[PDB]
């Protein structure tokens, strides 16, 4: 694919924005939301170029390592234009007072604010989210396994090329392109941090459930 | 500073390689080693360009967030040329059988192997380690605080420029430069992951101890 075809494919693959299911006229809400998003996550992952080329075992491993980071970056992206609040759903917009939960809440807000300051574009966001899917499990995986890693690194490389294409397209200098690429990728370290803190706070989709959702028939 | 002056400064700032203190003729060893390295860590941090320009409070916060990542990347760097082992010290080279410890052990080995495959250069390593110091605490911090963040981001940007300079210097194409920059920075997400897993396994230098070591007289 060209760089522009990568962007188009990623933008069309975007999952829908789900609603919280509480009676409008009247933690479980957050858990219920995450349950429903996971199914659409699977469908999104299978449309990330190169992902379905992996073994089903490798797909499960990547989704198992990445799922909370992917939910968290989606949240931070939705919340960008809502200073001081997290848009868990269009009908569930909470501030820090409504949130060990407030510690994680404050980190998500700070990431949303950093996105705001950098003026993160939707095209960049979908590249970052695909990078999370491919990268988060790649250091925790046979000849076929060596081939699986090479492929993942080639796909990651093409997303890097795509991010740079977007920035050159927008008129950034070569220096500004590298600098913004680095700033975006360092935010992924903070998203990993939050995911780890969140996985600590949650003590989770099982391998078998993920495999059951990924191991589709035709 | 020029890019080449950044590299020289960072290389000279490198801390010494400490030895384990056990009687050669005959977890505490790992803890003792980390205690001694922390003091040299402080001295190293104060020589990272731009770090001492921060408030003492901001320096402490950054070191508090980064210290285990910095110890871990140093370990992975030392261990690169020792497949299957971790060189905690020149006299303490352990394999995974000698190591919830083995889970973290295996992640460090995998990072060392990834460094090996990419042929990480010492000049790149010192850039990455400085990036960890400046980035790991920056999303968890007043007008002076806004000025502190701008400065940190400017220093981070200059290290990005330096990494690219090193890669262009080595003859990489512009495409290969961006791709390698991205590959290096994504490894920092895995180092953060390991640090979080390690901080979980350790349940640590206090704020006051760090401040006491950083709040030097003349
Ligand atoms: C029944 C089985 N399932 C499969 C395993 C399990 C699901 O685990 C969950 C539960 C809740 C969440 C929500 C949630 C929801 C939607 C969203 O888009 C993002 C998030 C983000 C997020 C901080 C991470 N969160 C929290 O509640 C939170 C906590 C403390 C501070 C702030 C926020 C995420 C995952 C239940
Ligand atoms: C007395 C007060 N101090 C201040 C707080 C506290 C210090 O905490 C420590 C203790 C130990 C370590 C060592 C250590 C040492 C040197 C090195 O260069 C790197 C590391 C890396 C590392 C995995 C992270 N580690 C482990 O033991 C390990 C565990 C499980 C699997 C593999 C390795 C790091 C930090 C004690």
Provide the domain count of chain A. Answer: 1
C-beta B76 within 6 A of ligand 2: no
Q: What does chain B look like in DSSP terms, one character per residue?
A: --HHHHHHHHHHTPPP-PPP-S-TT--HHHHHHHHHHHHHHHHHHTTSTTGGGS-HHHHHHHHHHHHHHHHHHHHHHHTTTSTTEEEEETTEEEEGGG--HHHHHHHHHHHHHHHHHHT--HHHHHHHHHHHHHHTTGGG--HHHHHHHHHHHHHHHHHHHHHHHHHHHTT--HHHHHHHHHHHHHHHHHHHHHHHHHHHHT----HHHHHHHHS---
CA-closest residue to ligand 1 atom 10: A31
Number of alpha carbons in the 13 Å side-chain half-sphere of residue A71? 27
Instruction: Compute CA B93 distance to the chain's CA centroid, rounded to the nearest angstrom.
Output: 20
Q: What is the largest CA-CA distance in chain A?
A: 58
Residue B116: CA count within 13 A, CB half-sphere = 15
C-alpha span between B91 and B73 (Å, rounded): 19
Alpha carbon of A91: minimum distance to chain B alpha carbons (Å): 27
CATH of the domain at B113: 1.10.565.10
CA angle A164, A170, A176 (to 5 degrees): 55
Q: Where are the alpha helices (DSSP H) in A52-142?
A: 56-78, 101-118, 122-135
Rounded to whole angstroms, the Cα distance separating A125 from A74 reads 9
Cβ B101 under 6 angstroms from ligand 2: yes
Q: How far is C-alpha B27 from the geometric centre of its chain's CA atoms?
A: 21
C-beta atoms of A200 and B197 within 8 A: no
Chain A residues with CB-CB distance to B193 below 8 A: 192, 196
Query: Any idea what DSSP says for residue A202?
Result: T
Of the candidates A131, A147, A121, the one whose C-alpha atom is nearest the C-alpha of residue A189 is A131
Angle at B113 between CA A160 and CA B132, to 5 degrees: 60
Task: Return d(Cα A8, Cα A14) in angstroms, integer.
Answer: 10
Contact (CB, 8 A) for B167 and B180: yes
Is residue B197 within 8 angstroms of chain A, CB to CB?
yes
Cβ distance of B193 and A190 shorter than 8 Å: no
Mutate to test the pocket of ligand 1, among A28, A29, A31, A72 (most ligand atoms within 8 A of CB): A31
Closest approach atom of ligand 1 to CA A195: 24
Tell me the residue range of the domain where B32 lies: 3-214
Task: List the residue whose alpha carbon is closest to atom 14 of ligand 2.
Answer: B30
Burial class (CB in 10 A: 0-12, 13-18, 19+), B216: exposed
- Decide if B111 and A139 are in contact by the 8 Å CB cutoff: yes
**C-alpha dist (Å) from residue B199 to A196, B76, B101:** 11, 17, 12
Structural method = X-ray
Phi, psi of B89 (to 5 degrees): -155, 160
Would you state the structure tokens that stand for residue B102, as one six-digit string?
């083995």
Of the residues A68, A168, A182, A200, the best mutation for testing chain B's interface (the one with the most B CB atoms within 10 Å of its CB) is: A182
Q: Which residues of B touch A135 (CB under 8 A)?
A: 186, 189
Instruction: Judge contact between A129 and A74, C-beta under 8 A.
Output: yes
């Amino acid at each position: 694919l060209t760089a522009d075809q990568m962007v188009s494919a990623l933008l069309d693959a975007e999952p829908p924005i789900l609603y919280s299911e509480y009676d409008p006229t009247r933690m479980g809400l957050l858990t219920n939301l995450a349950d429903r998003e996971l199914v659409h996550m699977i469908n999104w992952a299978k449309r990330v170029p190169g992902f379905v080329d992996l073994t089903l075992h490798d797909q499960v491993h990547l989704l198992e390592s990445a799922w909370l980071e992917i939910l968290m970056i989606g949240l931070v992206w939705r919340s960008m234009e809502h200073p001081g609040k997290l848009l868990f759903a269009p009908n569930l917009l909470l501030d820090r007072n409504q949130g060990g939960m407030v510690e994680i809440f404050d980190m998500l807000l700070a990431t949303s604010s950093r996105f705001r300051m950098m003026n993160l574009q939707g095209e960049e966001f979908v590249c970052l989210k695909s990078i999370i899917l491919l990268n988060s499990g790649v250091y925790t995986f046979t000849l076929k396994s060596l081939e699986e890693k090479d492929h993942i690194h080639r796909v990651l490389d093409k997303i890097t090329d795509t991010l740079i294409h977007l920035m050159a397209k927008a008129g950034l200098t070569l220096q500004q392109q590298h600098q913004r690429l680095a700033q975006l990728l360092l935010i992924l370290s903070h998203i990993r941090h939050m995911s780890n803190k969140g996985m600590e706070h949650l003590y989770v989709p099982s391998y078998d459930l993920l495999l059951e959702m990924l191991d589709a028939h035709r």
